Amino acid sequence: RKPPKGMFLSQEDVEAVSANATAATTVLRQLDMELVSVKRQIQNIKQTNSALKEKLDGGIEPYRLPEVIQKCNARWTTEEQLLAVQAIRKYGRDFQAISDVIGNKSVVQVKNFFVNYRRRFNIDEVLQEWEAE
Amino acid sequence: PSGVEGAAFQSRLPHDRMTSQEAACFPDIISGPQQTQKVFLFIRNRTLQLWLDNPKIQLTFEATLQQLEAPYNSDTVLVHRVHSYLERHGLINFGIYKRIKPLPTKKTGKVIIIGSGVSGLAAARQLQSFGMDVTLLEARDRVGGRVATFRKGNYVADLGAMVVTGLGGNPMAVVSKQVNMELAKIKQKCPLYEANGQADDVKVPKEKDEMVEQEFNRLLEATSYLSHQLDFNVLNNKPVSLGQALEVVIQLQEKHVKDEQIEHWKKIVKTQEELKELLNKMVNLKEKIKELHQQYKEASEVKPPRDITAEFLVKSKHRDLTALCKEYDELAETQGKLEEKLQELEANPPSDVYLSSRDRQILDWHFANLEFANATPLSTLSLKHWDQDDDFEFTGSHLTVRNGYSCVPVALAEGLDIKLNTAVRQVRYTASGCEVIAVNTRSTSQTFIYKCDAVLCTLPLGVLKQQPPAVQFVPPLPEWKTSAVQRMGFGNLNKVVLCFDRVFWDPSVNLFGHVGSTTASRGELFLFWNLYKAPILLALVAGEAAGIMENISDDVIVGRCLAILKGIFGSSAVPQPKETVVSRWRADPWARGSYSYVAAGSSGNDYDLMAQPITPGPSIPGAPQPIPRLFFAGEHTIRNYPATVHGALLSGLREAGRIADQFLGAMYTL
Numbered sequence A: 001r002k003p004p005k006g007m008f009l010s011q012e013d014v015e016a017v018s019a020n021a022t023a024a025t026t027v028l029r030q031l032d033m034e035l036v037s038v039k040r041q042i043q044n045i046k047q048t049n050s051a052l053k054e055k056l057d058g059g060i061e062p063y064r065l066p067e068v069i070q071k072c073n074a075r076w077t078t079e080e081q082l083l084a085v086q087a088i089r090k091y092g093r094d095f096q097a098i099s100d101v102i103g104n105k106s107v108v109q110v111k112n113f114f115v116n117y118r119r120r121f122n123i124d125e126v127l128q129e130w131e132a133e
Numbered sequence B: 001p002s003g004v005e006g007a008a009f010q011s012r013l014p015h016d017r018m019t020s021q022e023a024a025c026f027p028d029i030i031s032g033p034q035q036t037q038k039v040f041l042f043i044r045n046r047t048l049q050l051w052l053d054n055p056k057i058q059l060t061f062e063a064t065l066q067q068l069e070a071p072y073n074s075d076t077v078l079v080h081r082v083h084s085y086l087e088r089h090g091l092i093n094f095g096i097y098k099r100i101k102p103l104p105t106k107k108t109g110k111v112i113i114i115g116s117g118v119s120g121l122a123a124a125r126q127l128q129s130f131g132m133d134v135t136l137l138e139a140r141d142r143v144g145g146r147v148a149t150f151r152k153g154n155y156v157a158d159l160g161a162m163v164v165t166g167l168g169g170n171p172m173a174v175v176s177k178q179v180n181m182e183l184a185k186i187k188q189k190c191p192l193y194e195a196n197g198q199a200d201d202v203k204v205p206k207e208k209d210e211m212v213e214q215e216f217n218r219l220l221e222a223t224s225y226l227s228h229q230l231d232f233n234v235l236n237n238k239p240v241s242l243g244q245a246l247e248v249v250i251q252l253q254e255k256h257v258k259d260e261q262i263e264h265w266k267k268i269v270k271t272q273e274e275l276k277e278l279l280n281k282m283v284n285l286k287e288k289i290k291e292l293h294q295q296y297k298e299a300s301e302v303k304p305p306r307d308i309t310a311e312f313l314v315k316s317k318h319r320d321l322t323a324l325c326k327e328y329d330e331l332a333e334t335q336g337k338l339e340e341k342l343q344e345l346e347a348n349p350p351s352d353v354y355l356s357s358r359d360r361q362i363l364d365w366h367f368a369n370l371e372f373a374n375a376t377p378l379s380t381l382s383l384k385h386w387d388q389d390d391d392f393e394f395t396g397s398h399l400t401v402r403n404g405y406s407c408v409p410v411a412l413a414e415g416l417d418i419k420l421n422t423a424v425r426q427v428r429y430t431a432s433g434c435e436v437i438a439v440n441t442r443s444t445s446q447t448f449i450y451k452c453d454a455v456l457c458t459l460p461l462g463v464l465k466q467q468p469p470a471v472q473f474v475p476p477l478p479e480w481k482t483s484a485v486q487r488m489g490f491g492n493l494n495k496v497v498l499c500f501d502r503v504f505w506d507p508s509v510n511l512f513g514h515v516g517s518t519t520a521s522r523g524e525l526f527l528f529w530n531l532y533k534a535p536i537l538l539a540l541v542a543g544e545a546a547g548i549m550e551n552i553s554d555d556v557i558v559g560r561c562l563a564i565l566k567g568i569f570g571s572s573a574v575p576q577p578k579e580t581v582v583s584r585w586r587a588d589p590w591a592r593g594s595y596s597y598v599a600a601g602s603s604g605n606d607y608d609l610m611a612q613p614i615t616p617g618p619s620i621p622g623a624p625q626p627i628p629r630l631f632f633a634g635e636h637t638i639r640n641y642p643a644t645v646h647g648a649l650l651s652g653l654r655e656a657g658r659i660a661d662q663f664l665g666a667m668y669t670l
Ligand SMILES: Cc1cc2nc3c(=O)[nH]c(=O)nc-3n(C[C@H](O)[C@H](O)[C@H](O)COP(=O)(O)OP(=O)(O)OC[C@H]3O[C@@H](n4cnc5c(N)ncnc54)[C@H](O)[C@@H]3O)c2cc1C
Pocket: B114, B115, B116, B117, B118, B119, B120, B137, B138, B139, B140, B143, B144, B145, B146, B147, B159, B160, B161, B162, B163, B164, B165, B422, B423, B424, B425, B458, B459, B460, B463, B470, B471, B493, B494, B495, B585, B589, B590, B591, B593, B594, B595, B633, B634, B635, B636, B642, B643, B644, B645, B646, B648
């Protein structure tokens, strides 16, 4: 009915291998060269990746800064507000990054700041300034 | 099957349906009411049953009606018509049986049968039992032809036919019951022995043995799919052979092995390049982190009190460094998960090769074995038709004749006019009758003329193929006959008989294979036979090897035989053989080969063409269409059972019926 379990006999491959006198060994040699070609390509990219891994030796451990967390405070200080304004200038609408810089202000408090002091800190101008870069 | 249906089966007939044969003789019944057909069928089956239950004595019409019940014994003309039909066509009262009604006082008609092979002898017995004058002309000094049996003392080995291929529906089952006939079963266990350098040959482990054989079967079944479903039957205006197709199948399996490997290594590289691109990003990110750490460190060293912009710089660079260290850990996690997938892929490669040198050698033994069965290289067998007779194979385990297969023809030859040492040179057939011209084989100048009504030609196909002809036909055989002779394949296989003074092999093992070194010589002494308490080993030469081995002296052959035997049973425990016999069937002028095969470009239809009788032209021009004169029996003339003893036996029975119908008339249509 159909080829035995694991026997491969497509209409296409039959015509291709029968096409001429030595079409058989042509197709088989073509894949043998194809095979050794990919094998040497592996050996190479394995060596390239071996070299690149050696450049990453040590990781990023000397450059890891210790974790500093303080309680997420409610009160805005003059000092903190100014940090915020600068963070808006640098990061834009990245409420997360801005929150991380200030330290003790939640992502919502930052969003509140954006609308509370919207007039007084010209946050409109500040945001369009960031988009210029 | 069992009962009256068992009898129909044993006679190669459907129990519940009328055959084309029967439709011809009983057209009234088969075109008529369904009821009467079932009546017919029972009568037919019951008569067969009766015959088969006791084939040692003749079954008469009276004795048949005797054992019939109502309403089957009501219509006695139908019972007679059936009995006579079954009698004519040799379905009842064939072989060697005690006659109830002694032979007719005078004979009607005269028939010359060429060759006293089994087909000849079978027909001769029948024609004689139908009250005809029969004389067989045999070139050899013995009956049986391709049923040859070497004898010495009590030790016996068949150089010709040897295996009875199952008793279920085999006409030989009847013959064996009719005679002494001691049949011995064949233990199908066959260990294979491959070379091991200077060391003794190692038995192939059940691991490989079973996997290669199953691959062999799978390869055959694959060629069958390739033939039927894909129609790969003609290639460059030439018919595709089995070996031709097997190559294509094997090649496509190697292609697959390579295709699987390519896409596996290509699955590696695409990940090996994912790793490459990730490692590059990681190196660059480490560079920006290194630079950003310095920038932070510098900004952080501007000691308080700082103004808010200097304060922002510290906090800003700090946040940014944590964000880039966040990114590096994502990429470091991916790196490990890619390296883990890279080992996964490299731990599970696909199949290394399709077949190793060791495998392909064992597979070639299985091919050689198939070349032995079909008595021909697989490059000669028709892809589409080589196996057309597979459905008609008998049931039951295969057996051998203990006292030597020639037992059978000799027993069939009893009470027949057989002229031995008489080689037919020319067959003349005309409207008025026939004359057969033969010479004495011993002195070929001594000539013999035989005048007869009909000639039955049982000459082997190989003989019929000879160029220039060994037998001449006057007038020549028509194009349609000669073309069939041409197209049909007539193969070859040979046997070597090895007589030793002592049994040095495993006495409980019936047969063991030897694995050859190359494809070229896969058939060369590829298998060894052992049976009785007799110390004979029987070496088999098959495929392309058979033909070439015939051009090699007995000594060299016996040499190669011992070499292989030493290589298995120890280079010392193998004595010199006392008696050796080497068959050469292709060289034998009364055979010119071993038996037929379905050649590429032939088909089962050519076998029918072979059986077709010849009707000569009219003597006086304008005279009516004459009787058929020249008739053909033999292994090569029976579509459903070619290349066998039973097939020959049946072909003989067939012709005897056709000749009787033609020259004695059909008494059952009266
Ligand atoms: C090596 C071998 C092994 C075999 N093994 C088996 C087996 O295991 N099982 C199986 O079922 N079958 C087997 N067979 C096949 C079987 O032997 C034949 O199919 C069968 O014997 C054919 O009978 P036949 O009468 O058609 O031909 P034959 O038996 O050849 O009869 C033809 C006769 O005509 C004679 N003759 C030839 N030329 C002339 C002439 N010019 N004048 C007068 N007479 C002539 C021949 O000598 C021969 O006696 C085997 C055959 C061979 C060669």
